[PDB]
Amino acid sequence: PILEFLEEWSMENLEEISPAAIADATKIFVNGCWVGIHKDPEQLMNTLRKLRRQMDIIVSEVSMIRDIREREIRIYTDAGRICRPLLIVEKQKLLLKKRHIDQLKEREYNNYSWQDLVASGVVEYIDTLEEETVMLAMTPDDLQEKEVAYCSTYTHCEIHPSMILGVCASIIPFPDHNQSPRNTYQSAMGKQAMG
Amino acid sequence: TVINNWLLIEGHTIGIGDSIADSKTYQDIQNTIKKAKQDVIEVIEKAHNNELEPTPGNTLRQTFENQVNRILNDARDKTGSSAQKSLSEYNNFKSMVVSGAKGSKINISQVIAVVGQQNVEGKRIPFGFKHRTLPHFIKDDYGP
Amino acid sequence: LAGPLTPPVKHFQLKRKPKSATLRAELLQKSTETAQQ
Amino acid sequence: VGIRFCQECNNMLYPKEDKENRILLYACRNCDYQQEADNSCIYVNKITHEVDELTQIIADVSQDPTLPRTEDHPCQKCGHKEAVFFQSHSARAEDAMRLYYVCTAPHCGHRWTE
Amino acid sequence: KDILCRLEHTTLRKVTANTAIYYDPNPQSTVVAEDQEWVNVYYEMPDFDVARISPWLLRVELDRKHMTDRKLTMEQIAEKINAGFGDDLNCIFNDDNAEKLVLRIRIMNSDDDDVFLRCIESNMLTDMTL
Amino acid sequence: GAKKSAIGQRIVATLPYIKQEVPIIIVFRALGFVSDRDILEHIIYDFED
Amino acid sequence: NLCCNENASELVAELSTLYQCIRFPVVAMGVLKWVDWTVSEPRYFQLQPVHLALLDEISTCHQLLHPQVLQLLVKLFETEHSQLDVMEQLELKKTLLDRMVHLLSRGYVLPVVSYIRKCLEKDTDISLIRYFVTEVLDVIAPPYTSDFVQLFLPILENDSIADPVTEFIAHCKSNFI
Amino acid sequence: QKEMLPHVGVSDFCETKKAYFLGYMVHRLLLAALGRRELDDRDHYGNKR
Numbered sequence: 001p002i003l004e005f006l007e008e009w010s011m012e013n014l015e016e017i018s019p020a021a022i023a024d025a026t027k028i029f030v031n032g033c034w035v036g037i038h039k040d041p042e043q044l045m046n047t048l049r050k051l052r053r054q055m056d057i058i059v060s061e062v063s064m065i066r067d068i069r070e071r072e073i074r075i076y077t078d079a080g081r082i083c084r085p086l087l088i089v090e091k092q093k094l095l096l097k098k099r100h101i102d103q104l105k106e107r108e109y110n111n112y113s114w115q116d117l118v119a120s121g122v123v124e125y126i127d128t129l130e131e132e133t134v135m136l137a138m139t140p141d142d143l144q145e146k147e148v149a150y151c152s153t154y155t156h157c158e159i160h161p162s163m164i165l166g167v168c169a170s171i172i173p174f175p176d177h178n179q180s181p182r183n184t185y186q187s188a189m190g191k192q193a194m195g
Numbered sequence: 196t197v198i199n200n201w202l203l204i205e206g207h208t209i210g211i212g213d214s215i216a217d218s219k220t221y222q223d224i225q226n227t228i229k230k231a232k233q234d235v236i237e238v239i240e241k242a243h244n245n246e247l248e249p250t251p252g253n254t255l256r257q258t259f260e261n262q263v264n265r266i267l268n269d270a271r272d273k274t275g276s277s278a279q280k281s282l283s284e285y286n287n288f289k290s291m292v293v294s295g296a297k298g299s300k301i302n303i304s305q306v307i308a309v310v311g312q313q314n315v316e317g318k319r320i321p322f323g324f325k326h327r328t329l330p331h332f333i334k335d336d337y338g339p
Numbered sequence: 340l341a342g343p344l345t346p347p348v349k350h351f352q353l354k355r356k357p358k359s360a361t362l363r364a365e366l367l368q369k370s371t372e373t374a375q376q
Numbered sequence: 377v378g379i380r381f382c383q384e385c386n387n388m389l390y391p392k393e394d395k396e397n398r399i400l401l402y403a404c405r406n407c408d409y410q411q412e413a414d415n416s417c418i419y420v421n422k423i424t425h426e427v428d429e430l431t432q433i434i435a436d437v438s439q440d441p442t443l444p445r446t447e448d449h450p451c452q453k454c455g456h457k458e459a460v461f462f463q464s465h466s467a468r469a470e471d472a473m474r475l476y477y478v479c480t481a482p483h484c485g486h487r488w489t490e
Numbered sequence: 491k492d493i494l495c496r497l498e499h500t501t502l503r504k505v506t507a508n509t510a511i512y513y514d515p516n517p518q519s520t521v522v523a524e525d526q527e528w529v530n531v532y533y534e535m536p537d538f539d540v541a542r543i544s545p546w547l548l549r550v551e552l553d554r555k556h557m558t559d560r561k562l563t564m565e566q567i568a569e570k571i572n573a574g575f576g577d578d579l580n581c582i583f584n585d586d587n588a589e590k591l592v593l594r595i596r597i598m599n600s601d602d603d604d605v606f607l608r609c610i611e612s613n614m615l616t617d618m619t620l
Numbered sequence: 621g622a623k624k625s626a627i628g629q630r631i632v633a634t635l636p637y638i639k640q641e642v643p644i645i646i647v648f649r650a651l652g653f654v655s656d657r658d659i660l661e662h663i664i665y666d667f668e669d
Numbered sequence: 670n671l672c673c674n675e676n677a678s679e680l681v682a683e684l685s686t687l688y689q690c691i692r693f694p695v696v697a698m699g700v701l702k703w704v705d706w707t708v709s710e711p712r713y714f715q716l717q718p719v720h721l722a723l724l725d726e727i728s729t730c731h732q733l734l735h736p737q738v739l740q741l742l743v744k745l746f747e748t749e750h751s752q753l754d755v756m757e758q759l760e761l762k763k764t765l766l767d768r769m770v771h772l773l774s775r776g777y778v779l780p781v782v783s784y785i786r787k788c789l790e791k792d793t794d795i796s797l798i799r800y801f802v803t804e805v806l807d808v809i810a811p812p813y814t815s816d817f818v819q820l821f822l823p824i825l826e827n828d829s830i831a832d833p834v835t836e837f838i839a840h841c842k843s844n845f846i
Numbered sequence: 847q848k849e850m851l852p853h854v855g856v857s858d859f860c861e862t863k864k865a866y867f868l869g870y871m872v873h874r875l876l877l878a879a880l881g882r883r884e885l886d887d888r889d890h891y892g893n894k895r
């Protein structure tokens with residue numbers, strides 16, 4: 001379906017071009033297969049992010065990565081890649097509004113689910129390759145807020161920093177007040193506990 | 196035997212209150228930290244403007260890295276000395292370090308004032324991402 | 340108190356002045372740049 | 377040095393000398409087609425290789441969200457405030473920490489260094 | 491540091507700036523005017539080209555900063571090259587006072603003819619010790 | 621030798637089920653591309669570098 | 670306010686005010702003692718300096734404070750530095766001798782050259798002394814005095830490395846026996 | 847046709863696509879030789895599955 005979308009749009013196939021224009025265009029890869037080139041990559045990236053946030057043609061595990069310095073767009077829909085959710089930020093503002101949280105509070109007897117937040121394009125899955133092309137915000141309450149700006153272009157914001165922890169390391173109270181070898185020791189030992 | 200049986204009468208501990216310094220001490224530590232941050236910013240903008248000149252037998256990156264390294268080192272040492280000055284006579288950390296039975300002055304400076312610079316291979320944290328240590332920072336940043 | 344002062348015993352002619360005056364000029368124009376801020 | 381292919385079979389033209397006229401002739405091989413060469417120099421390589429990074433700068437980097445943006449260096453073609461500044465950070469490098477600036481205005485990719 | 495300079499292994503690659511195989515079949519009128527001025531000063535003495543000289547020019551320009559750093563003069567480098575290659579390389583050097591430190595190499599009068607100069611420069615860049 | 625170093629560094633490819641490597645232009649010739657300009661057009665997307 | 674601010678990075682900005690205030694001699698003495706306590710502290714050197722230019726201004730203005738600045742500089746010339754690289758220490762001492770030459774330009778030649786001859790014959794590297802005499806021979810011009818050659822000539826035979834040098838040898842040999 | 851670049855294809859006319867892919871591979875090899883693009887890291891987790 002991604003290739004169908006590209007054929008619908010102005011994606012120039014390799015066999016259908018002279019080589020000379022390749023330097024004046026951006027290469028397009030699909031799971032490591034060069035399919036062709038494109039002239040205005042920014043428009044294509046905007047459209048692809050729009051469609052993934054709308055889940056029209058693209059399921060929300062396909063990662064799109066635009067390397068400007070090499071003029072390349074790599075798209076991966078294969079298995080084995082690892083991603084995590086991240087909130088989307090535009091105009092230095094969260095797309096997550098209080099009405100979304102209100103809909104979340106009534107989850108039972110409402111049938112509003114996480115998949116609606118995925119469907120509304122407020123939270124999107126990002127993989128480690130695409131993370132390279134992200135200016136991420138730790139916390140929205142200070143970093144996106146106006147200040148003597150460290151950065152003024154934040155695309156994504158983390159839901160909560162504590163989710164970097166592991167399943168058996170998350171049980172540590174105040175893990176950021178301990179020498180990290182002690183955190184590894186506790187992670188090892190908690191699996192050995194009795195209960 | 197005799198020292199333990201006396202220690203029952205005396206007793207020894209370690210508490211949160213043993214890890215507290217004066218508000219003046221924290222303020223002085225924070226002033227030193229902001230001073231070091233501003234100095235590192237000065238060195239960064241000097242290197243950016245091609246105003247930092249390399250030392251003999253060292254490239255510009257080596258000169259900049261050594262300068263910022265020693266800035267953080269003496270800032271950490273000054274904060275540690277200030278923390279050591281703030282300790283009481285009843286501070287159990289000082290009891291355990293002066294006796295030498297456990298810990299060190301570096302450990303007290305770590306717990307109370309500044310954990311300090313982390314290192315891999317003897318250098319600061321490398322750019323695992325392209326020109327970035329983590330996504331939360333901007334590209335081509337060399338701050339502490 | 341001590342009356343007039345004896346000028347320094349001149350031992351030579353300065354065909355060129357030391358570079359500290361050049362450093363003075365550079366530091367002065369940098370001070371002007373700061374005052375511009 | 378100007379690199380040129382054969383006009384008959386598109387293989388590399390190799391320089392050669394004619395002892396009669398004493399002029400460089402870009403002669404092909406496996407096709408015996410000859411051409412008048414004029415550079416008087418077959419090969420140059422700068423071992424200094426202090427190349428201008430502005431050749432390798434690409435104006436599209438104005439679109440990146442991760443690069444730091446300065447508002448204190450107006451452009452020279454349009455005077456646009458916001459400019460994206462960064463370090464080239466290639467090989468033949470890691471001794472020049474200079475900042476290369478790209479004008480952030482659309483369709484004005486004026487690039488410079490300071 | 492002077493003694494230190496006499497210990498660190500120096501080669502042509504470390505001190506050279508760039509190289510160019512200019513064609514120049516006529517030694518009198520060289521293809522580069524910049525070459526031609528001091529060449530008229532130097533080929534004013536027609537020496538080792540009166541019999542014949544190669545029709546290939548190898549013009550190498552060297553960094554002044556490394557030469558001042560390593561205390562070298564162009565004359566001793568020319569003597570080292572001559573010791574390395576005998577008559578095989580006629581080396582004609584510009585006076586060591588110009589902006590660029592230039593040196594021309596041609597082949598012996600008794601003499602590949604063009605790729606052999608690539609062999610010469612590739613061998614001389616690293617293997618030669620100054 | 622004195623001539624391989626003269627020309628300079630070369631590029632090879634060690635193919636699967638082929639113990640010995642081969643040069644790249646040989647592989648491009650094997651894919652039916654004889655024009656070296658066409659071969660570089662697959663590699664060097666400009667010709668002003 | 671400037672010396673007690675200590676946040677100070679504004680020193681480059683306050684330089685004109687610093688010099689006009691230094692025109693008062695007591696202010697110059699205060700700046701001298703402040704610079705002494707500042708630079709004399711350990712680990713002061715993490716900068717590509719400026720306080721030494723303040724000492725240059727102090728020596729330029731008031732001749733009476735000439736013995737004081739030298740008494741500081743020689744102290745800074747004999748202090749040993751550990752965390753500074755040896756080449757960095759050498760360049761630091763070269764800067765200190767540049768300040769010594771600036772002081773010498775103001776007519777305080779004899780005690781400075783006497784200390785130089787002392788620390789030669791009594792330690793320091795010959796390179797720094799060669800650099801100092803090169804700087805002195807840069808700006809010097811004839812004519813001279815008997816005591817000046819008495820202090821400056823006998824140091825001038827222990828080395829033979831470099832033409833103002835041979836010019837001075839000819840002048841002093843002909844005129845100043 | 848088969849054992850080299852299977853993911854590109856095995857058809858008769860994807861030989862041109864395979865040629866372009868090989869040209870891109872050696873192009874990036876050239877860029878690493880000139881350092882126009884940096885070297886890749888085996889431990890960069892984006893190269894993992």
Ligand SMILES: [Zn+2]
Binds near residue numbers: 387404
């Ligand atoms: Zn041809």
Ligand SMILES: [Zn+2]
Binds near residue numbers: 453455481484485
């Ligand atoms: Zn502009």
